[PDB]
Design a protein around this motif. Sequence first.
Motif, short mmCIF file in Angstrom:
data_model
loop_
_atom_site.label_atom_id
_atom_site.label_comp_id
_atom_site.label_asym_id
_atom_site.label_seq_id
_atom_site.Cartn_x
_atom_site.Cartn_y
_atom_site.Cartn_z
N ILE G 3 -1.03 1.49 -7.11
CA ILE G 3 -2.46 1.80 -6.67
C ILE G 3 -3.56 1.43 -7.66
O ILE G 3 -4.54 0.80 -7.29
CB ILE G 3 -2.67 3.23 -6.15
CG1 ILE G 3 -3.96 3.33 -5.30
CG2 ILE G 3 -2.60 4.29 -7.31
CD1 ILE G 3 -4.36 4.78 -4.74
N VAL G 4 -3.40 1.90 -8.88
CA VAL G 4 -4.19 1.50 -10.01
C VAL G 4 -4.33 -0.05 -10.11
O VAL G 4 -5.42 -0.56 -10.29
CB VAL G 4 -3.56 2.05 -11.32
CG1 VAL G 4 -4.60 2.15 -12.38
CG2 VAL G 4 -2.88 3.43 -11.09
N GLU G 5 -3.23 -0.81 -10.01
CA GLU G 5 -3.39 -2.30 -9.96
C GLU G 5 -4.14 -2.79 -8.73
O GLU G 5 -5.02 -3.67 -8.88
CB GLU G 5 -2.03 -3.04 -10.00
CG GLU G 5 -1.22 -2.85 -11.29
CD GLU G 5 -0.56 -1.45 -11.36
OE1 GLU G 5 0.34 -1.10 -10.51
OE2 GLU G 5 -0.99 -0.71 -12.29
N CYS G 7 -6.11 -1.17 -6.30
CA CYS G 7 -7.44 -0.59 -5.95
C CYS G 7 -8.45 -0.55 -7.01
O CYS G 7 -9.59 -0.35 -6.75
CB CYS G 7 -7.24 0.77 -5.39
SG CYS G 7 -6.24 0.70 -3.93
N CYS G 8 -8.08 -0.87 -8.24
CA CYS G 8 -9.10 -0.98 -9.23
C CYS G 8 -9.80 -2.36 -9.46
O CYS G 8 -10.91 -2.39 -10.04
CB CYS G 8 -8.54 -0.46 -10.51
SG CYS G 8 -8.25 1.28 -10.57
N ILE G 11 -11.65 -4.16 -4.03
CA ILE G 11 -11.81 -2.93 -3.27
C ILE G 11 -10.62 -2.78 -2.30
O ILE G 11 -10.03 -3.75 -1.83
CB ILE G 11 -13.25 -2.70 -2.62
CG1 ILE G 11 -13.36 -3.27 -1.19
CG2 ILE G 11 -14.42 -3.35 -3.46
CD1 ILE G 11 -13.83 -4.91 -1.12
N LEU G 14 -10.02 2.17 3.35
CA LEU G 14 -9.35 3.36 3.74
C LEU G 14 -7.96 3.09 4.36
O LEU G 14 -7.09 3.95 4.32
CB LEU G 14 -10.22 4.02 4.84
CG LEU G 14 -9.75 5.35 5.50
CD1 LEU G 14 -11.08 6.06 5.56
CD2 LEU G 14 -9.13 5.34 6.91
N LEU G 17 -5.68 2.53 1.51
CA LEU G 17 -5.55 3.77 0.83
C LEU G 17 -4.58 4.75 1.54
O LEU G 17 -4.02 5.59 0.88
CB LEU G 17 -6.89 4.45 0.52
CG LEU G 17 -7.81 3.84 -0.52
CD1 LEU G 17 -9.23 4.29 -0.42
CD2 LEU G 17 -7.38 3.99 -1.96
N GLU G 18 -4.43 4.70 2.85
CA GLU G 18 -3.47 5.64 3.53
C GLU G 18 -2.02 5.41 3.22
O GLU G 18 -1.19 6.17 3.60
CB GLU G 18 -3.59 5.51 5.04
CG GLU G 18 -4.98 5.77 5.47
CD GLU G 18 -5.08 6.02 6.96
OE1 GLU G 18 -4.08 5.78 7.69
OE2 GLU G 18 -6.16 6.52 7.38
N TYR G 20 -0.83 5.27 0.35
CA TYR G 20 -0.52 6.22 -0.73
C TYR G 20 -0.54 7.68 -0.39
O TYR G 20 -0.47 8.49 -1.31
CB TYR G 20 -1.48 5.96 -1.90
CG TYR G 20 -1.32 4.54 -2.37
CD1 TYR G 20 -0.28 4.17 -3.24
CD2 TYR G 20 -2.16 3.58 -1.94
CE1 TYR G 20 -0.12 2.78 -3.71
CE2 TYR G 20 -2.03 2.14 -2.41
CZ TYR G 20 -1.01 1.78 -3.23
OH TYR G 20 -0.95 0.39 -3.64
N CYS G 21 -0.62 8.05 0.91
CA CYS G 21 -0.64 9.51 1.31
C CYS G 21 0.77 9.99 1.55
O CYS G 21 1.69 9.14 1.60
CB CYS G 21 -1.49 9.72 2.54
SG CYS G 21 -3.27 9.26 2.32
N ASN G 22 1.02 11.32 1.65
CA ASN G 22 2.32 11.75 2.02
C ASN G 22 2.51 11.63 3.47
O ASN G 22 3.65 11.52 3.81
CB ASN G 22 2.67 13.19 1.62
CG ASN G 22 2.53 13.41 0.19
OD1 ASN G 22 2.14 14.51 -0.24
ND2 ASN G 22 2.77 12.35 -0.60
#
Lengths: 29, 29, 29, 29, 29, 29, 22, 22, 22, 22, 22, 22
Positions: G3-5, G7-8, G11, G14, G17-18, G20-22
Amino acid sequence: FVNQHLCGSHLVEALYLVCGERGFFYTPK
Amino acid sequence: FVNQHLCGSHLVEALYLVCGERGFFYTPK
Amino acid sequence: FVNQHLCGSHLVEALYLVCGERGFFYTPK
Amino acid sequence: FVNQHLCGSHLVEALYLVCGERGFFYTPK
Amino acid sequence: FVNQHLCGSHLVEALYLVCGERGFFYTPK
Amino acid sequence: FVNQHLCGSHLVEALYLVCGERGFFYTPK
Amino acid sequence: RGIVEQCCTSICSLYQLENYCN
Amino acid sequence: RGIVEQCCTSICSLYQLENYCN
Amino acid sequence: RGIVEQCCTSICSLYQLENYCN
Amino acid sequence: RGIVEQCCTSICSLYQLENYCN
Amino acid sequence: RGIVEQCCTSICSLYQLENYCN
Amino acid sequence: RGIVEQCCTSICSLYQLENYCN
Ligand SMILES: [Cl-]
Ligand SMILES: [Cl-]
Ligand SMILES: [Mn+2]
Ligand SMILES: [Mn+2]
């Protein structure tokens, strides 16, 4: 540490600062 | 550099929003 | 998505994340 | 680089404060 | 560069947490 | 400026934006 | 790879980004 | 349909906060 | 010519920032 | 022992928020 | 010799950060 | 004239939050 109710994104950011390189789990239900 | 400690503060606020009731595990690793 | 009341700067930041490159309007009155 | 996506998060928090009841249009563009 | 104005936003949120009832003086100086 | 109750980390960040290069003191007790 | 690689630098929307959710 | 009344006083779904995107 | 360019490099004071309000 | 009930509804000490670290 | 220099380059833990409290 | 009582419990104008600047 602050002595307050920590809710929502505030509690997340606190976890972030506190746990550090070890990381954390947030499961709010 | 990219600062990953400052970026990680934003991403955990973003995951907080996006996951909601599901929650998430975060590890700066 | 989170299922909560989003107020103040939180609702701003949500708009930011959600709308993305398209951008948004915030007129709270 | 300057990261404009991380900076834009701060600026929209800053505009939220500074505009108040007026509100604002934001576009990362 | 390191942007100290964007970093200073995080640090003052972090000092707010860490000092609590003690409080702190901040100076970007 | 915004016409609201500013509490917790919000009031910190407001101080940050308002006072600027001069800096500020936060002593909440 | 992870994620760090991802999303940083660029951009992350969303939708990215999902993942990475449980 | 006012955003504060919608998402801050009530609760907004994701679709309802997209109404306020450009 | 415009906010992201002007406020992300140099600091923008609150006075510069009001120019972007409605 | 649920983190919301612990730290958001009640107040958590620093030791009690470390329980939720990895 | 001082916070902006020390906490913006390398991460500062909470223990480093208490040194800047009253 | 305590900042919490002033700006968090009551509402502060911009001039009243400048009192707390250095
Ligand atoms: Cl709040
Ligand atoms: Cl940043
Ligand atoms: Mn808040
Ligand atoms: Mn930031």
